[PDB]
Every structure is written in structure tokens, then in C-alpha cells.
Amino acid sequence: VSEPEGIGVALSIYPDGYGVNLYERPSDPIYAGNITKKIPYKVFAGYWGGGDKDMICLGGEKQWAYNKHFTIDWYKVRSKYPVGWGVNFYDGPSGNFLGNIDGSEVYNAHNRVGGYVDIGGNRWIKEEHVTITAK
């Protein structure tokens, strides 16, 4: 059974009590606040800015944080079908057809929108064709 929301789970790399900053506007972050309670937090979206500029969203628009401040257990995306059974991917949710995978690989969930999941590289698959699970 697939995780109904989210793309992964993040845990601060710092000690409990040590503030990790939250931001809005992930391409040019504006300080929004500070999280000091160290517990696992569900990740709802990713900003794929490349390297150190990657951010993860722990809620809504004012809950962006840098990936580098967390260890992240990404949700894993797997075909429902046997190896060799093609699964189409698109250039966005309900987007243009781009290609197919053969189901031999496991992917990390990079974003989920409108019943589609991005398996990375801007490749969006209908969620009906895959499982999205914590491990």
C-alpha cells in the first residue's frame, strides 16, 4: 500500500535543541523561522536547485529547509509490473509523453503532483502504475 502523502522523511543532522532554519522562496530563501525539536518530519516537496541549493518542504510555503541539514529517507518508487513491462513517463503531471522505464530499477520520489510522481530527471509517472513506500 502506497504512502498517501509525501515523498520522504527528514531528520536533523544536529543535536536535539539545535535550531534548523525554515524559509520561504526556495530559489532565493527568505528566513521564516526556526525548528529546534528534533523528530522525524514528513517531506512534502523538493526544490531541485542542485547540490547545496537543494531544499525540502516540511509543510507549506514557509517550511522550506536545506537538504544538507537533514538525513532524508526518500520514499521509494517501484513499478507494479514485472521487469520488462513498460511504464510511461511524462514531462510533468498530465504532460507530454517522453519515454518509458522497464521496471528493473527503484527510484526516489522527487515530487508528487496531481496523481503523478517524479522519479527524478523530470520524469513523471502516473501513481496508479507504481508503489510509493517508506522503504
Coordinates of all heavy atoms in Angstrom, one line a residue, residues 79-133:
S79 N 7.8 0.0 -10.0 CA 6.7 -0.5 -10.9 C 5.9 -1.5 -10.2 O 6.4 -2.4 -9.4 CB 7.3 -1.1 -12.2 OG 6.3 -1.6 -13.0
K80 N 4.6 -1.5 -10.5 CA 3.7 -2.6 -10.1 C 3.8 -3.8 -11.0 O 3.3 -4.9 -10.6 CB 2.2 -2.2 -10.1 CG 1.9 -1.2 -9.0 CD 0.4 -0.9 -9.0 CE 0.0 0.1 -7.9 NZ -1.5 0.5 -8.1
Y81 N 4.5 -3.7 -12.1 CA 4.5 -4.7 -13.1 C 5.8 -5.4 -13.2 O 6.8 -4.9 -12.8 CB 4.1 -4.1 -14.5 CG 2.9 -3.2 -14.4 CD1 3.1 -1.8 -14.3 CD2 1.7 -3.7 -14.4 CE1 2.0 -1.0 -14.2 CE2 0.5 -2.9 -14.2 CZ 0.7 -1.5 -14.2 OH -0.3 -0.7 -14.1
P82 N 5.9 -6.6 -13.9 CA 7.2 -7.4 -13.9 C 8.2 -6.6 -14.7 O 7.9 -5.7 -15.5 CB 6.8 -8.7 -14.6 CG 5.4 -8.5 -15.2 CD 4.8 -7.3 -14.5
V83 N 9.5 -7.0 -14.5 CA 10.6 -6.4 -15.3 C 10.4 -6.7 -16.8 O 10.1 -7.8 -17.2 CB 11.9 -7.0 -14.8 CG1 13.0 -6.4 -15.7 CG2 12.2 -6.6 -13.4
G84 N 10.4 -5.6 -17.5 CA 10.3 -5.7 -19.0 C 9.0 -5.1 -19.4 O 8.8 -4.8 -20.6
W85 N 8.1 -4.9 -18.5 CA 6.7 -4.3 -18.7 C 6.8 -2.8 -18.7 O 7.1 -2.2 -17.6 CB 5.7 -4.9 -17.7 CG 4.3 -4.5 -17.8 CD1 3.8 -3.2 -17.7 CD2 3.2 -5.3 -18.0 NE1 2.4 -3.3 -17.8 CE2 2.0 -4.5 -18.0 CE3 3.1 -6.7 -18.2 CZ2 0.7 -5.1 -18.2 CZ3 1.8 -7.3 -18.4 CH2 0.6 -6.5 -18.4
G86 N 6.7 -2.2 -19.8 CA 7.0 -0.8 -19.9 C 6.0 0.1 -19.1 O 4.8 -0.1 -19.1
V87 N 6.6 1.2 -18.5 CA 5.8 2.2 -17.8 C 6.1 3.5 -18.3 O 7.3 3.9 -18.3 CB 6.0 2.1 -16.3 CG1 5.2 3.3 -15.5 CG2 5.6 0.7 -15.7
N88 N 5.1 4.3 -18.8 CA 5.3 5.5 -19.5 C 5.7 6.6 -18.5 O 5.1 6.7 -17.4 CB 4.1 6.0 -20.2 CG 3.8 5.1 -21.4 OD1 4.7 4.5 -22.1 ND2 2.5 4.9 -21.7
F89 N 6.5 7.6 -18.9 CA 6.7 8.8 -18.1 C 6.5 10.0 -19.0 O 6.7 10.0 -20.3 CB 8.1 8.8 -17.3 CG 9.3 8.7 -18.2 CD1 9.8 9.9 -18.8 CD2 10.0 7.5 -18.3 CE1 11.0 9.8 -19.5 CE2 11.1 7.4 -19.1 CZ 11.7 8.6 -19.7
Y90 N 6.2 11.1 -18.3 CA 5.8 12.4 -19.0 C 6.7 13.6 -18.5 O 7.4 13.4 -17.5 CB 4.3 12.7 -18.7 CG 3.4 11.5 -19.2 CD1 3.3 10.4 -18.4 CD2 2.9 11.6 -20.4 CE1 2.5 9.3 -18.9 CE2 2.1 10.5 -20.9 CZ 1.9 9.4 -20.1 OH 1.1 8.4 -20.6
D91 N 6.6 14.7 -19.2 CA 7.4 15.9 -18.7 C 6.8 16.7 -17.6 O 7.3 17.8 -17.2 CB 7.8 16.7 -20.0 CG 6.6 17.5 -20.5 OD1 5.5 17.4 -20.1 OD2 6.9 18.3 -21.5
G92 N 5.6 16.3 -17.1 CA 5.0 16.9 -15.9 C 3.8 16.1 -15.7 O 3.4 15.2 -16.5
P93 N 3.1 16.4 -14.6 CA 1.7 15.8 -14.4 C 0.8 16.1 -15.6 O 0.7 17.3 -16.0 CB 1.2 16.6 -13.1 CG 2.4 17.2 -12.5 CD 3.4 17.4 -13.6
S94 N 0.2 15.1 -16.1 CA -0.6 15.2 -17.3 C 0.1 15.8 -18.5 O -0.5 16.5 -19.3 CB -1.9 15.9 -17.0 OG -2.6 15.2 -16.0
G95 N 1.4 15.6 -18.5 CA 2.2 16.3 -19.5 C 2.5 15.6 -20.8 O 1.7 14.6 -21.2
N96 N 3.5 16.0 -21.6 CA 3.8 15.4 -22.8 C 4.5 14.0 -22.6 O 5.4 13.9 -21.7 CB 4.8 16.3 -23.6 CG 4.1 17.6 -24.0 OD1 3.0 17.6 -24.5 ND2 4.8 18.7 -23.6
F97 N 4.2 13.0 -23.4 CA 4.9 11.7 -23.2 C 6.3 11.9 -23.6 O 6.7 12.4 -24.6 CB 4.2 10.7 -24.2 CG 4.9 9.4 -24.3 CD1 5.1 8.6 -23.3 CD2 5.4 9.1 -25.6 CE1 5.8 7.4 -23.4 CE2 6.1 7.9 -25.7 CZ 6.3 7.0 -24.6
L98 N 7.2 11.3 -22.8 CA 8.6 11.4 -23.1 C 9.3 10.1 -23.3 O 10.3 10.0 -24.1 CB 9.4 12.0 -21.9 CG 9.0 13.4 -21.5 CD1 9.9 13.9 -20.4 CD2 9.1 14.3 -22.7
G99 N 8.9 9.0 -22.6 CA 9.6 7.8 -22.7 C 9.1 6.7 -21.8 O 8.0 6.9 -21.2
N100 N 9.8 5.6 -21.6 CA 9.3 4.6 -20.7 C 10.5 4.0 -19.9 O 11.6 4.0 -20.4 CB 8.5 3.5 -21.3 CG 8.6 3.4 -22.8 OD1 9.7 3.0 -23.4 ND2 7.6 3.8 -23.5
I101 N 10.2 3.5 -18.7 CA 11.1 2.6 -18.0 C 10.7 1.2 -18.1 O 9.5 0.9 -18.5 CB 11.2 3.1 -16.5 CG1 9.9 2.9 -15.9 CG2 11.8 4.5 -16.5 CD1 9.9 2.9 -14.4
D102 N 11.6 0.3 -17.7 CA 11.3 -1.1 -17.9 C 11.0 -1.8 -16.5 O 10.7 -3.0 -16.5 CB 12.4 -1.9 -18.6 CG 13.7 -2.0 -17.8 OD1 13.8 -1.4 -16.7 OD2 14.6 -2.7 -18.3
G103 N 11.0 -1.0 -15.5 CA 10.6 -1.6 -14.2 C 11.7 -2.3 -13.4 O 11.5 -2.9 -12.4
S104 N 12.9 -2.3 -14.0 CA 14.0 -3.0 -13.3 C 14.7 -2.2 -12.2 O 15.4 -2.8 -11.4 CB 15.1 -3.4 -14.3 OG 15.6 -2.2 -14.9
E105 N 14.4 -0.9 -12.1 CA 15.0 0.0 -11.1 C 14.1 0.5 -10.0 O 12.9 0.6 -10.3 CB 15.7 1.2 -11.8 CG 16.6 0.9 -13.0 CD 17.9 0.2 -12.5 OE1 18.3 0.5 -11.3 OE2 18.5 -0.5 -13.3
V106 N 14.6 0.8 -8.9 CA 13.9 1.5 -7.8 C 14.3 3.0 -7.8 O 15.5 3.3 -8.0 CB 14.2 0.9 -6.4 CG1 13.4 1.7 -5.3 CG2 13.9 -0.6 -6.4
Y107 N 13.3 3.9 -7.7 CA 13.6 5.3 -7.8 C 13.3 6.0 -6.5 O 12.5 5.5 -5.7 CB 12.9 6.0 -8.9 CG 13.1 5.4 -10.2 CD1 12.2 4.3 -10.7 CD2 14.1 5.7 -11.0 CE1 12.5 3.7 -11.9 CE2 14.4 5.1 -12.3 CZ 13.5 4.1 -12.7 OH 13.8 3.5 -13.9
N108 N 13.9 7.2 -6.2 CA 13.4 8.1 -5.1 C 12.4 9.0 -5.6 O 12.5 9.5 -6.7 CB 14.6 8.9 -4.6 CG 15.6 8.1 -3.8 OD1 15.3 7.0 -3.3 ND2 16.8 8.6 -3.7
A109 N 11.3 9.2 -4.8 CA 10.2 10.1 -5.1 C 10.8 11.5 -5.0 O 11.3 11.9 -3.9 CB 9.1 10.0 -4.1
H110 N 10.8 12.3 -6.1 CA 11.3 13.7 -6.1 C 10.2 14.8 -5.9 O 10.6 15.9 -5.5 CB 12.1 14.0 -7.4 CG 13.4 13.4 -7.4 ND1 13.6 12.0 -7.5 CD2 14.7 13.9 -7.5 CE1 14.9 11.7 -7.5 NE2 15.6 12.9 -7.5
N111 N 9.0 14.4 -6.2 CA 7.8 15.3 -6.1 C 6.6 14.5 -6.4 O 6.7 13.5 -7.1 CB 8.0 16.6 -6.9 CG 8.6 17.7 -6.2 OD1 8.3 18.0 -5.0 ND2 9.5 18.5 -6.8
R112 N 5.4 14.9 -5.9 CA 4.2 14.3 -6.3 C 3.1 15.3 -6.5 O 2.9 16.1 -5.5 CB 3.7 13.3 -5.2 CG 4.5 12.1 -5.0 CD 4.0 11.4 -3.7 NE 2.8 10.7 -3.8 CZ 2.3 9.9 -2.9 NH1 2.9 9.8 -1.7 NH2 1.2 9.2 -3.1
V113 N 2.5 15.3 -7.6 CA 1.5 16.4 -8.0 C 0.4 15.7 -8.9 O 0.8 15.0 -9.9 CB 2.2 17.5 -8.9 CG1 1.2 18.5 -9.2 CG2 3.4 18.1 -8.2
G114 N -0.8 15.9 -8.5 CA -1.9 15.6 -9.5 C -2.0 14.1 -9.9 O -2.5 13.9 -11.0
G115 N -1.6 13.2 -9.0 CA -1.6 11.8 -9.3 C -0.4 11.3 -10.0 O -0.5 10.2 -10.6
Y116 N 0.6 12.1 -10.1 CA 1.9 11.7 -10.8 C 3.0 11.9 -9.8 O 3.0 12.8 -9.0 CB 2.2 12.6 -12.0 CG 1.2 12.3 -13.2 CD1 -0.1 12.7 -13.2 CD2 1.8 11.7 -14.3 CE1 -0.9 12.5 -14.2 CE2 0.9 11.5 -15.4 CZ -0.4 11.9 -15.4 OH -1.2 11.6 -16.5
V117 N 4.0 11.0 -10.0 CA 5.3 11.1 -9.2 C 6.5 11.3 -10.1 O 6.6 10.7 -11.1 CB 5.4 9.9 -8.2 CG1 5.4 8.5 -9.0 CG2 6.6 10.0 -7.3
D118 N 7.3 12.2 -9.7 CA 8.6 12.5 -10.4 C 9.6 11.5 -9.9 O 9.9 11.6 -8.7 CB 9.0 14.0 -10.2 CG 10.2 14.4 -11.0 OD1 10.8 13.5 -11.7 OD2 10.7 15.5 -10.8
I119 N 10.2 10.7 -10.7 CA 11.2 9.7 -10.3 C 12.6 10.3 -10.4 O 13.6 9.6 -10.3 CB 11.1 8.4 -11.0 CG1 11.1 8.6 -12.5 CG2 9.9 7.7 -10.6 CD1 11.5 7.3 -13.4
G120 N 12.7 11.6 -10.8 CA 14.0 12.3 -10.9 C 14.3 12.5 -12.4 O 13.9 11.7 -13.2
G121 N 15.0 13.6 -12.7 CA 15.2 13.9 -14.1 C 14.0 14.4 -14.8 O 14.0 14.3 -16.0
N122 N 13.0 14.9 -14.1 CA 11.8 15.4 -14.6 C 11.0 14.4 -15.4 O 10.7 14.5 -16.6 CB 12.0 16.6 -15.6 CG 10.7 17.3 -15.9 OD1 9.9 17.7 -14.9 ND2 10.4 17.6 -17.2
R123 N 10.8 13.2 -14.8 CA 10.2 12.1 -15.4 C 9.0 11.7 -14.5 O 9.2 11.2 -13.4 CB 11.1 10.9 -15.5 CG 12.3 11.2 -16.5 CD 13.2 10.0 -16.6 NE 13.8 9.7 -15.3 CZ 14.5 8.6 -14.9 NH1 14.6 7.6 -15.8 NH2 15.0 8.5 -13.7
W124 N 7.8 12.0 -15.0 CA 6.6 11.9 -14.2 C 5.8 10.7 -14.6 O 5.4 10.5 -15.8 CB 5.7 13.1 -14.3 CG 6.4 14.4 -13.8 CD1 7.4 15.1 -14.5 CD2 6.2 15.0 -12.6 NE1 7.8 16.1 -13.6 CE2 7.1 16.1 -12.5 CE3 5.3 14.7 -11.5 CZ2 7.1 17.0 -11.4 CZ3 5.4 15.6 -10.4 CH2 6.2 16.7 -10.3
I125 N 5.5 9.8 -13.6 CA 4.7 8.6 -13.9 C 3.4 8.6 -13.1 O 3.3 9.1 -12.0 CB 5.5 7.4 -13.4 CG1 6.8 7.3 -14.2 CG2 4.7 6.0 -13.4 CD1 7.8 6.1 -13.8
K126 N 2.3 8.1 -13.7 CA 1.0 8.0 -13.0 C 1.2 7.1 -11.8 O 1.7 6.0 -11.9 CB -0.1 7.4 -13.9 CG -0.5 8.3 -15.1 CD -1.5 7.7 -15.9 CE -1.7 8.4 -17.2 NZ -2.7 7.7 -18.1
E127 N 0.6 7.6 -10.7 CA 0.8 6.8 -9.4 C 0.1 5.4 -9.5 O 0.5 4.5 -8.8 CB 0.3 7.6 -8.2 CG 1.2 8.8 -8.0 CD 1.0 9.5 -6.6 OE1 0.2 9.1 -5.8 OE2 1.7 10.6 -6.4
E128 N -0.9 5.3 -10.4 CA -1.6 4.0 -10.5 C -0.6 2.9 -10.9 O -0.9 1.7 -10.7 CB -2.8 4.1 -11.4 CG -2.4 4.3 -12.9 CD -3.6 4.7 -13.7 OE1 -4.1 5.8 -13.6 OE2 -4.0 3.8 -14.5
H129 N 0.5 3.2 -11.6 CA 1.4 2.2 -12.1 C 2.5 1.8 -11.2 O 3.3 0.9 -11.5 CB 2.0 2.7 -13.4 CG 1.0 2.9 -14.5 ND1 0.0 1.9 -14.8 CD2 0.8 3.9 -15.4 CE1 -0.7 2.3 -15.8 NE2 -0.3 3.5 -16.2
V130 N 2.6 2.5 -10.0 CA 3.8 2.3 -9.2 C 3.3 2.2 -7.7 O 2.3 2.6 -7.3 CB 4.8 3.4 -9.3 CG1 5.5 3.4 -10.6 CG2 4.1 4.8 -8.9
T131 N 4.2 1.6 -6.9 CA 4.1 1.7 -5.4 C 5.0 2.8 -5.0 O 6.1 3.0 -5.5 CB 4.4 0.4 -4.7 OG1 5.6 -0.1 -5.1 CG2 3.3 -0.7 -5.0
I132 N 4.6 3.5 -3.9 CA 5.5 4.6 -3.3 C 5.5 4.3 -1.9 O 4.4 4.4 -1.2 CB 4.9 6.0 -3.6 CG1 4.7 6.3 -5.1 CG2 5.7 7.1 -2.8 CD1 4.0 7.6 -5.4
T133 N 6.6 3.8 -1.3 CA 6.6 3.2 0.0 C 7.8 3.8 0.8 O 8.7 4.3 0.2 CB 6.7 1.7 0.0 OG1 7.8 1.3 -0.8 CG2 5.4 1.1 -0.6

